[PDB]
Structure 1
């Protein structure tokens, strides 16, 4: 049998038949569940993955079992036998990147998974050309505030040659300077990469919102430093619709969330450099990036300016300040005409995705703990939706830091 899955707001019940096809294994066993852990973790095996991928492709275009389907299978079979690897067709790479997004269990934004611009950078041959490809990505995806989802795919891993890597975890990151107390000026999430940036010749700053340079790695080659042109990096100054002093906090965030440190895996090929980007959900900025105690940690500062009683928890000063910070983020992005989505609309759209995917594939891999937003969880519909978490391929995967 297949896991029965229930929505408790509405009473509806589905069965996730797709989960039976989970190839790779997660961290849970019948004896104990580890679903809350942040990081859970041969021509023959390559071929069954490639085969399965090719089968997925030909199903998506409703030409399963066709002459072209059998010929492509045979072609991949013969190329793996001759060379130990194979090359994707362009249309397969596009389909593969969209499937990896569609399969990501921790992404609430997957209603968009079919609108993804895929830049083929598989002919890239240097760190310098890499930088050109990334700048075109940022330009296209920013679109002067009307943000567009995109992925740029650099050459696949292959034996006898080092990987392309982007060392930065995102294309746009703020510097995090280790003050000597152990404190930090700027973003503490970025202390390691900031120091590697300086270790490699970047002249630092001392502001809180200093955009980091990119550390780009060509095969068998130390990383090279590249400064982003300031007009390529769209930023939003934060202000609050009614709390005028808020603007004096001097807060900013960048428009484009572009993750650059994950591995794209398609039919057994691995792409260690394939940055992808969408647009922000406001709670990522307002609640996590600004209010996490180990990020910018502004919550007490705002609550005091709001004149709340911060000496007892029962006044809910924390909740009130966080709500207003999230209001500032939404108001500020809308005022700047930069795409943003709030957690209520985002989770509503995700519920539509679950319904589409149940029809299309008989299920959807989803990580409840990551889909429910970090404030107001039970106020969104995903809170009341049971979910099944499992790993399908194509996939985006975490990978070791290249240093």
Structure 2
């Protein structure tokens, strides 16, 4: 079966065959499309074909398909599964696996970089203290004094689902949010609930607008423990504007390291429930979403005031005007401080080239248009005009429930 995608700007037509290797569900049916929907303990039974599927892909990739090495490995994994109900990946397989989960991540526009991923094997970790040490090392390596390097740290896989390793933070670095008794919010409104948890767990909150949250780390299904990332490891960028001298006085700054820590990495049927990964920011994540969402720092008004735009009617587009300036400032600031960042034009242009390369060499590139198109200026970027097919390949990154909702407290 063949599927075609068309770019409506260039009339370039691509043919997808890769989707034939798709696995899990989309959430859609012939009767309904759930394209804009944000969200959607394993037996040996289901486990061996998943292991075998993965190992076949791995051995194909190194051009050793059907080799004695391939066959021995299947044999080895098979026995280990029937003996122990699970199996351990070789280091090479883990690395291949982690890289491919990123390659497969249909919501990630940064995938041109997928083969350059530093994989830190933390499968020997046994305690929250050990997790903390690993994560510190990841932060320091990835930050690299502003010259950011993509990395992922992989903690031990799930066993019976009662000994899960989890990073409770949604991201390694985020700012605290505090609800005031008057209903106003200080800091990042999105993080109010998680901040309360941290506080309950013993965190002494400074209660400012940009307090870096402590790590809340769970090893082996035990109660999570709090750790503060050494401040000297947390790289931050004061936000200023190249033309507007008043922008610095807004008091804005942001952290340089975007690092997702709440997702589950599936490789060959195995589940890695703690697998924090990091790259570098695309400007709009901070400038559009973090700063300008009504549910976040929500600075559009203050900025527009300082620009003295006509704010009495939306049709003056004062919001769009301020939005652009804020995004210029974020890009300006990061560049001036020599902290790796990419603008939405560069990143989408590079994604289109990555995508075409993937079609040519791989027969497809699953992509979620809803997430790929940037949250400002969508149609002046090339991805807007690009038809995409969304499907799910493994290895993959999956959502998982938030740990505070499922954890059995030991006390």
TM-score bucket (shorter structure): over 0.9
Aligned to 2:381: 380
Which residue in the other structure is 2:198 paired with? 197
1:296-335 matches, cutoff 5 A = 296-335=297-336
TM-superposition CA deviations, 1:224-276 (whole Å, max 9, x none): 11011110000000000000000000100000001111011100000100100
Q: Which residue of 2 aligns with 1:361?
A: 362
SS at 2:348 equivalent = helix
- Distance in 1, matches of 2:182 and 2:97, equals 47
2-side partners of 1:394 and 1:2: how far apart?
A: 23
Structure 1: unaligned runs, 5 residues or longer:
none
Partner of 1:44: 45
Aligned positions of 1:1-400 closer than 5 A: 1-40=1-40, 42-159=43-160, 161-400=162-401
Tell me the CA shift for residue 26 of structure 1.
1.4
Q: Secondary structure at the match of 1:244?
A: coil
Secondary structure of 2:158's counterpart equals coil
SS at match of 1:106: coil
Give the CA deviation at 1:160.
7.4
Q: C-alpha displacement at 1:44, in angstroms?
A: 2.3
CA-to-partner distance for each residue in 1:29-65, whole Å, 9 max, x for gaps? Answer: 111111000112x212111110010011111112112
**Aligned mates of 1:359, 1:76 — CA distance in 2:** 33
Aligned length: 402
Distance in 2 between residues matched to 1:220 and 1:381, nearest whole Å: 45
Residues of 1 paired with 2:46 and 2:362: CA distance? 24
Between 308-317 and 279-288, the greater mean CA deviation after superposition: 308-317
CA distance in 2, matches of 1:160, 1:303: 50
In the TM superposition, residue 286 of structure 1 has moved relative to its aligned partner by 0.1
Return the alpha-carbon distance in structure 1 between the equivalents of residues 300 and 287 of structure 2.
Answer: 10
Whole-Å separation in 2 of the counterparts to 1:292 and 1:397: 25
Structure 1 residues 44-53 or 287-296, which shifts more?
A: 44-53
Distance 1:320 1:170 in 2: 30
Q: What is the rounded CA distance, in whole Å, between the counterparts of 1:293 and 1:344 in structure 2? A: 24
Offset at residue 181 of structure 1 (A)? 2.5
SS in 1 for 2:81: helix
The 2-side partners of 1:352 and 1:206 are apart by 45
Instruction: Measure how far apart 1:316 and its partner are.
Output: 1.1
The C-alpha deviation readout for 1:352-390, integer Å capped at 9, x for no partner, is 110111122100110001000000100001111000001
Partner of 2:408: none
Q: Distance in 2 between matches of 1:79 and 1:90?
A: 17
Structure 1 353/160 Cα, relative in aligned 2: closer, same or farther at 3 Å? closer
CA RMSD of aligned residues (A): 0.9
Q: Which moved more, 1:92-101 or 1:53-62?
A: 53-62
Cα distance in 1, alignment partners of residues 13 and 360 from structure 2: 13
TM-score normalised over the length of structure 2: 0.96
Distance 2:143 2:49 in 1: 38
Q: TM-score, normalised by structure 1?
A: 0.98
Equivalent-residue separation in structure 1 for 2:311 and 2:163 (angstroms): 53
> What secondary structure is seen at the aligned counterpart in 1 of 2:285?
helix
Q: CA–CA distance in 2 between the matches of 1:304 and 1:241?
A: 18
Report the alpha carbon displacement of residue 161 of structure 1 after superposing the two structures with TM: 4.8
Distance 1:334 1:220 in 2: 42
Residues 181-210 of structure 1 deviation map (CA, whole Å, 9 limit, x = unaligned): 332100011111100000000111221100
What SS does the corresponding residue of 2:109 show, helix, strand or coil? coil
